Design an enzyme around this catalytic site. Structure first.
Site, PDB file in Angstrom:
ATOM      1  N   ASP A 192      -1.768   5.755  -5.479  1.00 39.15           N
ATOM      2  CA  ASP A 192      -2.109   4.520  -4.243  1.00 39.15           C
ATOM      3  C   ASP A 192      -2.174   3.799  -4.349  1.00 39.15           C
ATOM      4  OD1 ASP A 192      -3.398   3.633  -1.956  1.00 39.15           O
ATOM      5  OD2 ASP A 192      -4.707   5.121  -0.987  1.00 39.15           O
ATOM      6  N   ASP A 241       0.513  -1.251   0.292  1.00 38.65           N
ATOM      7  CA  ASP A 241      -0.199   0.101   0.076  1.00 38.65           C
ATOM      8  C   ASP A 241       1.207   0.771  -0.259  1.00 38.65           C
ATOM      9  OD1 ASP A 241      -2.311   1.332   0.341  1.00 38.65           O
ATOM     10  OD2 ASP A 241      -2.156   1.600   2.579  1.00 38.65           O
TER      11      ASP A 241
HETATM   12  C1  LIG Z   1      -3.913   5.079   6.322  1.00 42.10           C
HETATM   13  C2  LIG Z   1      -4.263   7.157   7.002  1.00 42.10           C
HETATM   14  C3  LIG Z   1      -3.150   7.832   6.660  1.00 42.10           C
HETATM   15  C4  LIG Z   1      -4.690   7.278   8.519  1.00 42.10           C
HETATM   16  C5  LIG Z   1      -4.923   7.296   5.905  1.00 42.10           C
HETATM   17  C6  LIG Z   1      -6.710   7.508   6.002  1.00 42.10           C
HETATM   18  C7  LIG Z   1      -7.481   7.735   4.770  1.00 42.10           C
HETATM   19  C8  LIG Z   1      -7.290   8.042   3.753  1.00 42.10           C
HETATM   20  C9  LIG Z   1      -5.843   7.311   2.849  1.00 42.10           C
HETATM   21  C10 LIG Z   1      -4.995   7.540   1.541  1.00 42.10           C
HETATM   22  N1  LIG Z   1      -5.476   5.609   1.030  1.00 42.10           N
HETATM   23  C11 LIG Z   1      -5.990   4.042   1.318  1.00 42.10           C
HETATM   24  C12 LIG Z   1      -7.058   4.673   0.495  1.00 42.10           C
HETATM   25  S1  LIG Z   1      -8.496   3.335   0.837  1.00 42.10           S
HETATM   26  O1  LIG Z   1      -9.249   3.615   2.144  1.00 42.10           O
HETATM   27  O2  LIG Z   1      -9.124   3.737   0.079  1.00 42.10           O
HETATM   28  C13 LIG Z   1      -7.647   2.269   0.524  1.00 42.10           C
HETATM   29  C14 LIG Z   1      -6.495   2.466   1.691  1.00 42.10           C
HETATM   30  C15 LIG Z   1      -5.527   0.835   1.999  1.00 42.10           C
HETATM   31  C16 LIG Z   1      -7.114  -0.809   2.081  1.00 42.10           C
HETATM   32  C17 LIG Z   1      -7.692   0.160   3.620  1.00 42.10           C
HETATM   33  C18 LIG Z   1      -8.262  -1.370   3.828  1.00 42.10           C
HETATM   34  F1  LIG Z   1      -9.561  -1.279   4.857  1.00 42.10           F
HETATM   35  C19 LIG Z   1      -9.064  -2.636   3.449  1.00 42.10           C
HETATM   36  C20 LIG Z   1      -8.053  -2.310   1.805  1.00 42.10           C
HETATM   37  C21 LIG Z   1      -7.179  -1.337   1.447  1.00 42.10           C
HETATM   38  C22 LIG Z   1      -8.792  -3.520   0.652  1.00 42.10           C
HETATM   39  C23 LIG Z   1      -8.060  -4.242   0.135  1.00 42.10           C
HETATM   40  C24 LIG Z   1      -7.754  -3.415  -1.357  1.00 42.10           C
HETATM   41  C25 LIG Z   1      -8.764  -2.901  -2.156  1.00 42.10           C
HETATM   42  F2  LIG Z   1      -7.994  -1.895  -3.228  1.00 42.10           F
HETATM   43  F3  LIG Z   1      -9.154  -3.567  -2.564  1.00 42.10           F
HETATM   44  C26 LIG Z   1      -9.242  -2.075  -1.535  1.00 42.10           C
HETATM   45  C27 LIG Z   1     -10.298  -2.986  -0.377  1.00 42.10           C
HETATM   46  C28 LIG Z   1      -9.936  -4.499   1.769  1.00 42.10           C
HETATM   47  N2  LIG Z   1      -9.877  -3.041   2.915  1.00 42.10           N
HETATM   48  C29 LIG Z   1      -5.129   3.104   1.883  1.00 42.10           C
HETATM   49  O3  LIG Z   1      -4.307   3.469   2.683  1.00 42.10           O
HETATM   50  C30 LIG Z   1      -5.067   6.613   4.046  1.00 42.10           C
END
Ligand SMILES: CC(C)(C)c1cccc(CN[C@H]2CS(=O)(=O)C[C@@H](Cc3cc(F)c4c(c3)C3(CCC(F)(F)CC3)CN4)[C@@H]2O)c1
EC number: 3.4.23.46
Length: 374
Positions: free
Chosen positions: A222, A36
């Site tokens: 991302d 990630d």
């Molecule tokens: C960590 C931090 C700095 C607090 C933060 C907060 C809000 C947004 C962001 C920006 N990056 C985010 C964007 S997101 O939330 O859409 C995916 C997230 C990683 C992520 C977290 C999950 F609980 C889940 C997934 C990815 C899955 C698996 C892979 C996928 F791409 F299929 C999607 C589903 C399943 N659940 C990134 O890290 C960072």
């Protein structure tokens, strides 16, 4: 080249992310870890949650050290909370070293793990500024670089297919994974991998929006996200313009919302009726930019169920998110050392007979600095 240990070390199920094999602890416990570039915490399941194939068992690790502090990370998609510690970490299909990284032992979670997925953790590749609880917690790649002579640099070649594959070259660039040349855009700030988009064209026609709209409140690369996410207004102009190019047919509202598939008889998908999309990125040189171009084969994800597809450009709460749909067309180089991101056409990108993905430049764009939100 000379990175074949690492070529093709990424697995996953489409729409479920890419993960890489890792080992933690002495003796080494193997786990599949979601890759990630959109976060900065390294976290693994540490208990027999029913969805998990395996989990990190600290009892077994002689090298495990407890840190006695808690940690909580809310993503958009999901949430976990755990206990902090450190341990020996290595990536088998990577450079043979070992590092003492921080680890978040996940003790409780909700809507974080996917029932059916084959991964058990997440590797936050972004910068400490956005690590939790706070920037004092060294992200994994910071640790890898400080503790070895591995170059402060990694690259991802994500190859869109149920199964998916790709490569994460650590500490290097593997030139056989792309064609043409690499173009670099500046990393605007070291927290997320943030970038400036200075222009958007659809089949060649400028969307004609003030470029500040492309980046409110930021644009980031991302890998943990599936879709190309655009800011609301930008999303409207984009879909409007794609409908127009594809008026030769028309589709339900829900298709453009990503809630309803569209299907064709196998092998008859009217690819030519969908526009290539282009993002111009700020370049290395003042007033210079370049352009990446994705085909409809990138933003129409195939889904089992004929040939059926989901529209995979969607609306964004943040600014632009270049997720998998974008990255699966390109070889992306995260050059942390030179503080820049590189793009080249991917060797493994899906393309038709008449058109192909592209990275071209240079272009002249004035006032690029104004495309950022401040
Ligand atoms: C960590 C931090 C700095 C607090 C933060 C907060 C809000 C947004 C962001 C920006 N990056 C985010 C964007 S997101 O939330 O859409 C995916 C997230 C990683 C992520 C977290 C999950 F609980 C889940 C997934 C990815 C899955 C698996 C892979 C996928 F791409 F299929 C999607 C589903 C399943 N659940 C990134 O890290 C960072």
């Amino acid at each position: 080249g000379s990175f074949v240990e690492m070529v093709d070390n990424l697995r996953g199920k489409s729409g479920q992310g890419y993960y890489v094999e890792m080992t933690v602890g002495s003796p080494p416990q193997t786990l599949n870890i979601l890759v990630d570039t959109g976060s900065s915490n390294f976290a693994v399941g540490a208990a027999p949650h029913p969805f998990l194939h395996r989990y990190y068992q600290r009892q077994l690790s002689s090298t495990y050290r407890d840190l006695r502090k808690g940690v909580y990370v809310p993503y958009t998609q999901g949430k976990w909370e755990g206990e902090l510690g450190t341990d020996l970490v290595s990536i088998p299909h990577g450079p043979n070293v070992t590092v003492r990284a921080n680890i978040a032992a996940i003790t409780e979670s909700d809507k974080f793990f996917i029932n059916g997925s084959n991964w058990e953790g997440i590797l936050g590749l972004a910068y400490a500024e956005i690590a939790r609880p706070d920037d004092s917690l060294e992200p994994f790649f910071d640790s890898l670089v400080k503790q070895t002579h591995v170059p402060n640099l990694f690259s991802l070649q994500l190859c869109g297919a149920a199964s998916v594959g790709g490569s994460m070259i650590i500490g290097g660039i593997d030139h056989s994974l792309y064609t043409g040349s690499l173009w670099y855009t500046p990393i605007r700030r070291e927290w997320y991998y943030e970038v400036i988009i200075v222009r958007v064209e659809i089949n060649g026609q400028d969307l004609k929006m003030d470029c500040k709209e492309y980046n409110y409140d930021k644009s980031i690369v991302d890998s943990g996200t599936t879709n190309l996410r655009l800011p609301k207004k930008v999303f409207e102009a984009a879909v409007k313009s794609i409908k127009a190019a594809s008026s030769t047919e028309k589709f339900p509202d829900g298709f453009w919302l990503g809630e309803q598939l569209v299907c064709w008889q196998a092998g008859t998908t009217p690819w030519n009726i969908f526009p290539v999309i282009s993002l111009y990125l700020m370049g290395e040189v003042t007033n210079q930019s370049f352009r990446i171009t994705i085909l409809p084969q990138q933003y129409l994800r195939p889904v089992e169920d004929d040939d059926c597809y989901k529209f995979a450009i969607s609306q964004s709460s943040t600014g632009t998110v270049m997720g998998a749909v974008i990255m699966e067309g390109f070889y992306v180089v995260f050059d942390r050392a030179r503080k820049r991101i590189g793009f080249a056409v991917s060797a493994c990108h899906v393309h038709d007979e008449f058109r192909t993905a592209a990275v071209e430049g240079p272009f002249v764009t004035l006032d690029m600095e104004d495309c950022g939100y401040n």
